[PDB]
Design an enzyme around this catalytic site. Structure first.
Site, short mmCIF file in Angstrom:
data_model
loop_
_atom_site.label_atom_id
_atom_site.label_comp_id
_atom_site.label_asym_id
_atom_site.label_seq_id
_atom_site.Cartn_x
_atom_site.Cartn_y
_atom_site.Cartn_z
N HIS A 147 0.47 -1.19 0.22
CA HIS A 147 -0.02 -0.04 0.03
C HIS A 147 1.04 1.49 0.49
O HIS A 147 2.20 0.97 -0.25
CB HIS A 147 -1.12 -0.12 1.32
CG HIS A 147 -1.71 -1.27 1.57
ND1 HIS A 147 -3.27 -0.85 0.45
CD2 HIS A 147 -1.81 -2.52 1.60
CE1 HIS A 147 -3.75 -2.49 0.51
NE2 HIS A 147 -2.76 -3.04 1.64
N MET A 187 -10.29 1.81 -3.46
CA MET A 187 -9.25 2.05 -2.14
C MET A 187 -9.14 3.66 -2.54
O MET A 187 -8.16 3.50 -2.61
CB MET A 187 -8.74 1.29 -2.13
CG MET A 187 -7.34 1.15 -0.72
SD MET A 187 -6.78 -0.39 -0.75
CE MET A 187 -5.74 0.81 1.22
N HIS A 210 -4.09 -0.33 -5.08
CA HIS A 210 -5.53 -0.20 -5.59
C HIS A 210 -6.34 0.95 -5.97
O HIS A 210 -7.58 1.07 -5.25
CB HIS A 210 -5.99 -0.92 -4.15
CG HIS A 210 -4.81 -1.89 -4.03
ND1 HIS A 210 -3.83 -1.08 -2.77
CD2 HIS A 210 -4.99 -3.16 -3.96
CE1 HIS A 210 -3.60 -2.47 -2.39
NE2 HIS A 210 -3.84 -3.95 -3.32
N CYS A 258 -4.95 4.31 -3.38
CA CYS A 258 -4.06 3.85 -3.66
C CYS A 258 -4.00 3.63 -4.44
O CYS A 258 -4.50 3.73 -6.04
CB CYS A 258 -4.34 2.25 -2.79
SG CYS A 258 -3.29 1.63 -2.11
CU LIG Z 1 -4.52 -0.14 -0.56
#
Ligand SMILES: [Cu+]
Length: 97
Positions: free
Chosen positions: A39, A90, A85, A82
Protein backbone atom coordinates in the site's frame (compact mmCIF):
# COMPACT_ATOMS: atom_id res chain seq x y z
CA UNK A 1 -9.12 12.45 18.52
CA UNK A 2 -6.26 10.35 17.21
CA UNK A 3 -7.52 8.15 14.40
CA UNK A 4 -6.06 5.54 12.09
CA UNK A 5 -6.42 4.57 8.45
CA UNK A 6 -6.54 0.86 7.73
CA UNK A 7 -5.70 -0.29 4.22
CA UNK A 8 -7.68 -3.40 3.40
CA UNK A 9 -10.69 -5.21 4.82
CA UNK A 10 -10.97 -8.60 6.49
CA UNK A 11 -12.79 -9.49 3.29
CA UNK A 12 -9.48 -9.53 1.46
CA UNK A 13 -10.85 -6.35 -0.08
CA UNK A 14 -8.28 -3.61 -0.68
CA UNK A 15 -10.09 -0.51 0.53
CA UNK A 16 -9.41 2.37 2.89
CA UNK A 17 -11.06 1.96 6.27
CA UNK A 18 -12.78 3.65 7.61
CA UNK A 19 -13.87 4.72 4.14
CA UNK A 20 -14.58 8.04 5.82
CA UNK A 21 -12.66 9.74 8.61
CA UNK A 22 -13.25 12.92 10.57
CA UNK A 23 -10.95 14.91 12.83
CA UNK A 24 -10.19 18.40 14.08
CA UNK A 25 -7.43 20.87 13.29
CA UNK A 26 -4.59 19.49 15.38
CA UNK A 27 -5.61 15.85 15.31
CA UNK A 28 -3.59 13.01 13.82
CA UNK A 29 -4.37 10.38 11.21
CA UNK A 30 -2.44 7.13 11.45
CA UNK A 31 -2.17 4.54 8.71
CA UNK A 32 -1.82 0.79 9.03
CA UNK A 33 -1.78 -2.02 6.49
CA UNK A 34 -4.57 -4.55 6.82
CA UNK A 35 -3.87 -6.85 3.90
CA UNK A 36 -3.87 -7.13 0.12
CA UNK A 37 -0.71 -5.06 -0.01
CA UNK A 38 1.46 -3.44 -0.57
CA UNK A 39 0.00 0.00 0.00
CA UNK A 40 0.95 3.66 0.23
CA UNK A 41 -0.38 7.16 0.75
CA UNK A 42 -1.29 8.95 -2.46
CA UNK A 43 -3.58 11.84 -1.59
CA UNK A 44 -5.85 13.20 -4.30
CA UNK A 45 -5.89 16.88 -3.41
CA UNK A 46 -6.74 19.18 -0.53
CA UNK A 47 -7.99 22.77 -0.25
CA UNK A 48 -5.78 25.71 0.64
CA UNK A 49 -4.09 25.06 3.96
CA UNK A 50 -2.35 21.72 3.54
CA UNK A 51 -0.35 20.05 0.80
CA UNK A 52 -2.09 16.87 -0.28
CA UNK A 53 0.19 16.64 -3.33
CA UNK A 54 3.17 16.48 -1.00
CA UNK A 55 2.35 14.20 1.91
CA UNK A 56 1.80 11.47 -0.65
CA UNK A 57 4.45 8.90 0.18
CA UNK A 58 5.35 6.49 -2.59
CA UNK A 59 7.32 4.46 -0.08
CA UNK A 60 5.23 1.35 -0.63
CA UNK A 61 5.62 -0.18 2.82
CA UNK A 62 5.85 -3.88 2.04
CA UNK A 63 6.51 -4.77 5.65
CA UNK A 64 3.04 -5.04 7.19
CA UNK A 65 2.55 -3.50 10.61
CA UNK A 66 1.88 0.22 10.60
CA UNK A 67 3.04 2.61 7.90
CA UNK A 68 3.15 5.86 9.85
CA UNK A 69 1.17 8.72 11.33
CA UNK A 70 0.82 12.38 10.44
CA UNK A 71 -0.79 15.36 12.13
CA UNK A 72 -3.01 17.82 10.31
CA UNK A 73 -4.43 21.26 11.02
CA UNK A 74 -5.80 22.78 7.83
CA UNK A 75 -9.61 22.68 8.00
CA UNK A 76 -11.46 20.95 5.19
CA UNK A 77 -12.07 17.56 3.64
CA UNK A 78 -9.03 15.66 2.41
CA UNK A 79 -9.24 13.00 -0.28
CA UNK A 80 -6.78 10.28 -1.20
CA UNK A 81 -6.42 6.93 -2.92
CA UNK A 82 -4.25 3.85 -3.33
CA UNK A 83 -1.79 4.13 -6.18
CA UNK A 84 -2.01 0.37 -6.79
CA UNK A 85 -5.52 -0.35 -5.56
CA UNK A 86 -6.82 2.47 -7.73
CA UNK A 87 -9.21 0.36 -9.76
CA UNK A 88 -9.94 -2.00 -6.89
CA UNK A 89 -11.82 0.95 -5.44
CA UNK A 90 -9.68 1.95 -2.48
CA UNK A 91 -10.43 5.59 -1.78
CA UNK A 92 -11.21 7.44 1.43
CA UNK A 93 -11.60 10.87 2.98
CA UNK A 94 -10.41 12.84 5.99
CA UNK A 95 -12.10 15.82 7.60
CA UNK A 96 -10.40 18.33 9.86
CA UNK A 97 -13.16 20.26 11.59
CU1 LIG B 1 -4.16 -0.50 -1.02
Amino acid sequence: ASVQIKMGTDKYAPLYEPKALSISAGDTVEFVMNKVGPHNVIFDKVPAGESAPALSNTKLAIAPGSFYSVTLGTPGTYSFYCTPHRGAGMVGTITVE
